[PDB]
Design a protein around this nucleic acid. Structure first.
Lengths: 143, 60, 95, 73
RNA sequence: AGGUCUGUGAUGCCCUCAGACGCCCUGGGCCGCACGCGCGCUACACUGGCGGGGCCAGCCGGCGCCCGCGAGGACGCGCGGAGCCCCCGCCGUGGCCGGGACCGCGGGCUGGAACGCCCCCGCGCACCAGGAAUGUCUUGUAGGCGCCCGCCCCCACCGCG
RNA sequence: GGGUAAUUGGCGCAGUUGGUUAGCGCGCGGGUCUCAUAAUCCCGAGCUCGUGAGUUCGAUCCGCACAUUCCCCA
């Protein structure tokens, strides 16, 4: 705070993970524009990285920008727990990771394939587009 | 043309058109003391000071 | 003082009602009692402020003050004066 | 639709906003937002600076709204 | 000729009565979904949302200690009350930090048995005050805010208060 | 060919160097279904050029389509 004037290095629009970010928003709500990052996971990531959180994202010097990347590929080392992650107990390697953009779409596609060849109830339903949980159809939910 | 303000001295009942209007007798305290009759909406009472845009209209 | 001046300058002095029947509007111009006048003035002040501050950045209080000042000045920029004039004309048309 | 910045791009602060406000008798965060087309937060910060300097003074205060008076005349 | 023979050791006349319409067990279903409409709930934001703190009810009423982010759990005793609101800050008109449907990993409770109910991370649908049409209301009233009982192994957007 | 008159908003119509003009008509609103009422908002090379003037649908002039009357040796 007490940042009135644009710093000499202010960067009007940030690009990261193929997504673009604006420099008028506060930092922890701009990262929410990434797919895989929310409010809770962001406050935790930055804090570990010794970054201010009530700062406009345009004053984010690249030195603080890189250390942030280093913490989103190896987060478990950096002290973050495992109940705070997107993917706990993967179906194959049994480990735990956090999956960002691009990874999510590929990952979501392969499960359905797993569901399809295995011949479950959910897989057959997904392919005619019905409710998967037990939430009732018939009433409401009509054009 | 210039509205004048009249005083009430007698109310003589409502109308049958849903009972919203009330007939009212008034007097020009400006000096003329003309006791006429008009039609008024809303709650009225004796000694009220109506404001009139016409010095020459009637009702009955 | 400003507030009383507004409540005075706001408030109709004439209105139209249905009494002439005849299968149509047959509206008749009438006069308006003071109590109704003050009630309507207050209502119009509040309503005009409310309509401005909705989905606008500015707050309710500034809208309130602006409406009060303009109505007290007799200016027709306000909502209250405009409604007063509207009613007066649709009435005098029916007198 | 409309967009406004959150951070002043350098000389902009003083070449107008400071000048403009100093020629106002009364002021609030929202007025100044709508006047020179900047977000409200910057208004908060600036007015803090100014009450520190001394040009303006508080007449009414509250979390929802505070209003100032120009003590420079 | 309103409803109730599906509340009853209330019942007339019919039908079923040893491959049973009796009684008991195992599964499934009453919930399935191109569609029309009835009572409700949540919102459309600044007269606001988030974070921290202060504080008062009534029908009435149960608590300590230790684990766990939490929901919950192990032990042990008889003891006990909230939301709106108010104060300080952040956001700054952007389908945005408004709104929280749908979906993908995971942790628990009830129970003989989850298809049921709770919690955590991520994804983040319609919706800008609503056409022809229509309902309710006069003082602690409307409206707004929450809290208890009923049915109940678990569960309240319902109902009585 | 000669004379006369006129061409306007989606509609006929009055308006003529300083209103884009009146009605009709557009839809959203109010007014016990909500129309005849009223309120409000919308609809433009005013046929086409030039001429002077602070300023022409608007005064003169150029040409085209429409209507009435009148004229005629390649």
């Amino acid at each position: 705070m007490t940042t009135i004037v644009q710093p000499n290095d202010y960067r009007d629009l940030l690009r990261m993970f193929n997504t673009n970010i604006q420099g008028k928003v506060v930092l922890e709500c701009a990262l929410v524009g990434i797919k895989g990052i929310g409010r809770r996971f962001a406050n935790v990531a930055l804090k570990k990285a010794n970054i201010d959180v009530h700062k406009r994202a345009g004053e984010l010097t690249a030195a603080e920008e890189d250390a942030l990347m280093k913490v989103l590929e190896d987060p478990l080392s950096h002290g973050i727990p495992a109940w705070m992650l997107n993917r706990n107990n993967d179906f194959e390697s049994g480990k735990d990771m956090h999956i960002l953009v691009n990874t999510i779409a590929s990952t979501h596609r392969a499960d359905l394939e797993r569901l399809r060849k295995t011949r479950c109830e959910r897989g057959v339903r997904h392919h005619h587009n019905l409710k998967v949980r037990g939430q009732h159809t018939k009433s409401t939910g009509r054009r | 043309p210039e509205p004048i303000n009249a005083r009430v001295i007698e109310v003589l009942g409502r109308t049958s058109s849903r009972g919203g209007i009330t007939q009212v007798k008034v007097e020009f305290m400006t000096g003329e003391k003309r006791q006429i009759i008009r039609n008024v909406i809303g709650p009225v009472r004796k000694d009220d000071i109506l404001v009139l845009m016409e010095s020459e209209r009637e009702a009955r | 003082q400003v507030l009383v001046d507004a409540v005075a300058n706001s408030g109709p002095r004439e209105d139209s009602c249905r009494i002439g029947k005849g299968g149509q509007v047959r509206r008749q111009s009438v006069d308006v009692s003071p109590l109704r006048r003050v009630n309507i003035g207050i209502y119009n002040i509040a309503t005009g402020a409310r309509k401005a501050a909705f989905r606008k950045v500015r707050p309710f209080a500034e809208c309130l003050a602006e409406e009060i000042m303009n109505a007290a000045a007799g200016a027709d920029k306000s909502y209250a004066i405009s409604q007063r004039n509207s009613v007066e004309r649709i009435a005098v048309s029916n007198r | 639709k409309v967009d406004y910045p959150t951070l002043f791009a350098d000389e902009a602060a003083m070449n107008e906003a400071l000048k403009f406000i100093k020629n106002s008798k009364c002021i609030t965060h929202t007025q100044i937002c709508e006047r020179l087309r900047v977000s409200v937060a910057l208004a908060k910060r600036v007015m803090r600076q100014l009450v520190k300097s001394g040009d303006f003074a508080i007449v009414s205060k509250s979390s929802r709204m505070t209003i100032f008076k120009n003590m420079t005349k």
